[model samples]
Target: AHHHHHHSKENESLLGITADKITSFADWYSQVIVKSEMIEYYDISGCYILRPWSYFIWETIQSVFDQKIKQHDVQNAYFPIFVTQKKLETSPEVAWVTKSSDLAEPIAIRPTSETIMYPYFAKWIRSHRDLPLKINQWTSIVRWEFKHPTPFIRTREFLWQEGHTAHSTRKEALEMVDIILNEYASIYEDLLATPVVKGTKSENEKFPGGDITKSIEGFIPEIGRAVQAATSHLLGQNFSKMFGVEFEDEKGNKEYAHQTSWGLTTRAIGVMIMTHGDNKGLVLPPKVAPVQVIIIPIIFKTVITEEQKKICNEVECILKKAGVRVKIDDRSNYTPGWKYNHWEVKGVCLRFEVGPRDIEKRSVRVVVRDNMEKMDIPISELESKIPKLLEEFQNRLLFKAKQRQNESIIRVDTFDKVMDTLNQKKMVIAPWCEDVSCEEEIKKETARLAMKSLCIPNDQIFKIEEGKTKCFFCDKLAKKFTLFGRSY
Candidate 1:
């Protein structure tokens, strides 16, 4: 319940983010994360507190995935939060070093669940009847490597859903990769209003101890960097062999189970923020905004009327019944003007204004937070109109971000051109041979600010336009078209 107060808090006026986003990104991001109520700094370096506002966005994504993944026969399970030293060696993803002497044995906090989950797989699977064993766990893991943690982006501890699945054949395991990849892409493009390109990671960039790694890459135009939105790996007996996870086939032959692992983390929230946020604050996509609509009843002359209060109630009911997340700013302590800035910074998608004027005309003043375009619509029209407006707002945000991505991509041919493009802060699409040495050369030449390969597009095929095209970094004949950008 919200209560009205006669007085307001003294320090209600919050400091705004003064640093420009592009020129002073570190300052701008830190300020936005704190002031926007998304995060708070912790004493330990590279650790951040995920405030409620930000976690709501993650939970919003999580709920939809929980219902969807189960449709493919995925079961939810939990692994031990800590792993023993013997099991830690199962994967090379994390470095284990120190141990306290007081305990009988030391264990490391899990950075990923592969080491913790697969040993049980070996004990549980016996025959072809258990052909597919799929499980997902929503949990947090620790890495303790990052020096400077950015909230929801590069933190020492983060939350994510890691899925592990075992299959009978190579073909079946490969099919699951495409299925999970499509879901990850949908989470970004459909729910978050962020567009992403799907591709296969290079040898150096691939997940450690995995046969093939495919990722959905989200672009940030301000810094000309590409963020790996999510990763799906086809382990192909890599972990199965290490943990002795095998199964008996129909023919009575014993074989190691082919496996797949995929993960989507809180870092996707950071990508969404960078894609659509502005100087004001985070401009959340309507689909995921915690409060998609905020209704304020404009009052004056230290007086209140029943009609004013009644309209607010009616509007709330209409929107709630229509399935919009709506909130009313009925607190009397803060002025209506103050509530406007508060919700604007909070990135509420749309606002409905019901005042003396609006009540007299039987209409409400609708203000869009994304563009601040206001309109007057009759009460009879709002239930139908507001939902349509929110839909249009969500689509426009996606279109504008995609427009920036389409314009930022530059196709080039020479080493000189590539360096020049990198300096300008844009994604450069160039042909590259699948050679580690050429990649090393490119990384060395662009050392001050590395021009790392983002991906090799799965959908687009690079043809020989000049009989034989050479890699942008070296003279080797090109293998495929690749995306290069500044390392995030």
Candidate 2:
């Protein structure tokens, strides 16, 4: 542990993370985010400042998800954050702005956009042609949460995209739910290189006042907890009935439109960190890494020739031309070893080291961050070779995560088995009656360990033999094999 000494300038050095990822996960996570310059601790509790390193990852995710939704006729829009008391009545845990100045009424900030946007939907949708109204907004909402706040995961105010849509019929609304859910899965699997199980939330855990809630769930092998990566909910006339979101039918009759709302927040970044970060620091996937490749030149006092300098610049330009997010760190004040440690802590996917030997050999020493495997590439093949390596690196992260997730899921037929697997820090798949009461009692029985049902996977892990197989906790005939684990 290197402490920063302010008085002695020469003693200032990087704060190597001191907490072990396995035994002290929360402390280790805090150190990784802060030391890597991804997050800054704010003055207020439950609030954190997202520095450029972390914000860049969010932007990358936004660009990909936005493009996918736009292709399906979803248009971007904006909504107000403040609402009147009458409109905010239905929402709880809203942060109200009551002290700015004395006014006719104190307005409350939005906890979610459903109440803020639905009234407008009623006014806008007048005919059958306007039935399929799809709109999304990228905004931050404030909820005065009472629990211990974790950055990105359970912050009081966090950034997210809320997509609200209305359709002519229930079938169209439910179809949109699945479409958005799949897109969310792709963001986790394709862009972030994290494997997720796509499934529906149990009745006890579903979004409030929503008909059906589907999510992409991710697992953290180190912490042994599941994360809800993203959620898509079918409102199914619930909001339509409340706000009178009615449209004129082709038969000249007024009908309430079915609605759906989906959201993916900054929490996904936390999931990535918990899933892939190691004791060294973050192990970023190449696709979403802000700096995909970092180029640093090794110098030996007077031995560095002009040719060596030229090679370093040449490698930088070549990778940039090939569309890699490349940067050259040639600061003379720091040693090469210091620079290497710096970038490694920041989780740059690939590193290119150019020195006298590399210059003479017409090659660059390349290193992969995830595995720390070193290779040498001919300078001539830099363009074609680097991208393939990045793809390979991306695939390898997902493959390893998938392998761990597949192996950790344990199937059992008794409640004792559920507790045994959970105590061992593993996910449990057990036959469930699919009853809300059974789910609630499971939470109560395992309250000390904080374990509960994660989801009922669409692809069942095991077949439930209708009347023969029984729920692990209850005597009721098993209906489906549900996944259960402690979650964030």
Candidate 3:
């Protein structure tokens, strides 16, 4: 009789350890990025390089939004990094910072491109024909962020596209701003599988030089924090007047043109990763997953044969012809279990398992990365079923995230509750009197929490009553109710 041996079960639960339950997510984030091969740290503080795996997702985002901007006749352009002292002085509302240097000129780095881009607009606009001079640039910006840097969330240097456009009338400019805001909301909701609360930012929280700023705020799952994913701003005539971007109307009267600037950044990728990712690894949406499906063949040395190779090739051909992003792990050195873990860590949206039993049944075991559900899909239905499964998985991920967000959101009426919620690390939806002094006071008083006053929710529940309670800090009547939280 052959000798039989069994491994001890004392440490069986160790095999079930997941990324979600592995202590604080901040620590898990560092491990997940390395395990997933998404990004690596650089020598400089608060900066990182986008590895190929992560850059591909950014390429997808650029392609999608670039097309949308061009559809609105927005031309792409580049601008200088250095801002002049005179221009910086003109906007008192703009935030300026200086790094150690010999020169006392005190120039500001390009934070959002408004002050720099608008001055050039004045020189370019001459007549009504030049009214809608739409231009955008894909670049990185620097902000003196005090927060401890996370891989992509609070990085000093990150990739983003800033669009600046000028129109003849305020109506056109405001309309354009709304259009871009909706585009950002769609990108977060549809492409990223992330739900967003759309609204206008408060005067204190608005973009410094913008007349009106619109934002799509996202809810992060790991810590239950609300992040402002992206924003679009309507400048009205402020930028035009500051930069002297005046154009002759149809009646030959010269006036400053209405302006709008909008942007979305690579930080959306960070939000997506944080929201959907589990302890197993990154759970990428199909829209952005570089490799949509990966195939790992399970074969033993005794079972491996020419017939299995033919089946694998045939499956690959079918997936390729169907326009699916698919790859096969044909290397014999790595075991099937290892390949599964590797791909799961990388967040492939779908996986196809082909083995002797699967081939015998003329089917493939389809596994979804989002929920880890498996089904044996017939080979004939691979083309139709795979796409449908991907769509469903994407929708399900968004729904689940939204559900988590709904659960995490709490309503607080007093300062005590606010402090309690902050200590607990929960997002609070509360009425604020829209006083800048009050906001500043809270910031100074509460070192444990960071406040982000995003736009009022479009729905009825978030709407503030005409004469509700006073401000949490001040006795003044409250303005719109906003979501505040301790963010990453």
Candidate 4:
């Protein structure tokens, strides 16, 4: 068994990633996810099985987001996966339906829950007291896509948490949209350590049947693309008018309720991977890494001494007591070098290596995963030092990504400049008239490498010169500066 293990090490290509992330990003991402044990390709073309390692990260994110929503009085609930064809009619092109023999009508799988839930909302909310009803559900969605499908990023079916709320006043409904959008911003920035632009979608990109769609857009510097991180829509009585969601006001007058719907999906996980992962493999932030630290004991002699194993266990307990998700690997079958390579690819935040010499010195060799730096910490300082190091590691990763994000955005005043910037694999902030025809013309001009408006950022850095500035494509008076990029 030991001989076979040693022989397998010769074929390192089988265990390590073969694709370079910068040159071949699509191939590199596909290899990293599977080799890291985060995803398994399923028989279905656009579906994948999230292995335990990946599921744990999703659960960790879910826990943090769930607690935040609960504080805002958002109640959790579930809805039927199969909606009546009549109810799900206001849907998409690629909806999955199941027909067993012959029934009165075939029920279609939910592309979204708006039509199915609003009918019930119309019945349950009958008075002023029931106006601000908020409900969120964590569920799976299916859309049979004909385009190229990627795991987490463009899967046919994936998981997401969608929140829907109703309010008596339009002011209240719009306020909730911004509130939920900020919450999503926190999840992307605070929890995931990835930077995003909080902005409003252009009229051409806004959700149908909604007044306004606000979203947080994340940038992929490697591919020079922008991905929609999350979206919150102010329905503004559109769905309410369609579904008859009405409530009696305090003045005994019946009025249509205003509504908002917001969602954050597993696509976020893909964005994080694209932004942070290096040539080595997945590089997870400490806050979201399932296993924060891994302790491996080195055995120099034929058999490991009890003292060496005991010290590794002690380090694990000390970190665990300090609120670190840590594990000790004392398996005699694997060498210390093998353990280090295994955890490095898995993206453990920190690695603690113990040996007889370090045990004698009362110190353990600690390795930081992101930078591959090594240091020795005394046993007594493990509690304080470990947390600080992890915090620094998390901050450093975010800082570097933020730097790249800032560098990748170019400001252009002409259509020629826009194409030049895009040819260099960079996104641009361009003056736009916000017309659908101009947007379409831009897409046509850049059809070779298709690009579109990502968003009109809320924090505008460039001031448009009212009527003086001209549109990048159509030469009309510029109304806004929109971030344009080839999107995923």
The reply for model 4, stretches above 4 Å from the true place, is 1-13, 90-93
Name the 10 consecutive residues with the lowest summed lDDT in model 1.
Answer: 1-10
TM-score of 4: 0.95
> Which of 2 and 3 is ahead in TM-score?
2
TM-score of each: 0.93, 0.95, 0.89, 0.95
Q: What would the per-residue lDDT of candidate 2 be over residues 135-227, giving only the tens digit for each residue?
A: 999998788888899998889889999999999999999999999999999999998888899989898989988999998888877778878
Worst 10 residues of 3 by lDDT: 1-10
Better of 1 and 4 by lDDT: 4
lDDT of 3 by residue, 55-147 (tens): 998998899999998889999989988787787656442335565655666676777777787777888899998668899999987765777
What RMSD, rounded to one decimal, does every model reach? 4.8, 4.0, 5.4, 3.9
Candidate 4's residue-wise lDDT over 310-377, tens digit each? Answer: 78878888998999999887777867667776777678998888887899999999888777788989
Global lDDT of each model?
Answer: 0.83, 0.85, 0.78, 0.85
Off by over 4 Å in 3: 1-22, 87-109, 300-304, 448-452, 462-465, 468-473
Error of 2 at 129 (Å): 1.2
Clashing residue pairs, backbone N/CA/C < 3 A, model 4? none
Q: Write the per-residue lDDT of candidate 1 for residues 123-159, one digit (tens) a residue.
A: 8888879989999999998887634566777777889
